Structure 1
Amino acid sequence: MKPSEIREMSIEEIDKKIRELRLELAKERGVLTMENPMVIRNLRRDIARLLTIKREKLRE
């Protein structure tokens, strides 16, 4: 999940991926109350990447 791949795609796919990632994050934070404690961090930063690059595109 890197800009190399992200910048190869279109905008609709990016928004869809953001959506599914946010749902994943909510579910993982739900279970965290009750392995691999870095899933949340990596999800957050993937979301940030996607938004940054989508904005680069929609600005140019």
Structure 2
Amino acid sequence: MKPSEIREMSIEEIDAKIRELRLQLAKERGLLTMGTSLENPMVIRNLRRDIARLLTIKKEKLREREKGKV
């Protein structure tokens, strides 16, 4: 995902996306040791970095909200 499209959504949507990506990462990690014919061996890395982006941007949004409120 891209930082612009991540910033386009709100905190609740970011949280739901984070949960979905964590579950999907667990499923891919299971399939990695289950199967052998992996079409895309970069799914795990991409999912991890999207989770990192989502968490970073959500924390940035929280900081901005606190700064605006204060």
Q: Give the TM interval when normalised to the shorter protein.
A: over 0.9
Shift of 1:36: 0.4
Question: Normalising by structure 1, what TM-score?
Answer: 0.94
Determine the structure 2 residue equivalent to 1:13: 13
Tell me the number of residue pairs that the alignment of Structure 1 and Structure 2 aligns: 60
Deviation at 1:2, TM superposition (A): 0.3
Which has the greater radius of gyration? 2
Distance in 2 (alpha carbons) for counterparts of 1:5 and 1:32: 29
Kindly state the Cα deviation for residue 26 of structure 1 after the two structures are TM-superposed.
Answer: 0.3
Q: Which runs of 5 or more structure 1 residues have no equivalent in the other structure?
A: none
Q: Which runs of 4+ in 1 moved over 2 A?
A: none
Give, in angstroms, the shift of residue 55 of structure 1: 0.3
CA distance in 2, matches of 1:33, 1:43: 17
Supply the RMSD in Å over aligned alpha carbons.
Answer: 1.8
Shift of 1:6: 0.7
Instruction: Supply the distance in 2 between the matched residues of 1:44 and 1:8 (Cα, whole angstroms).
Output: 20
TM-score, length-scaled by structure 2: 0.81
* Structure 2 gap ranges (5+): 63-68
State the Cα distance separating 1:39 from its structure 2 match. 0.2
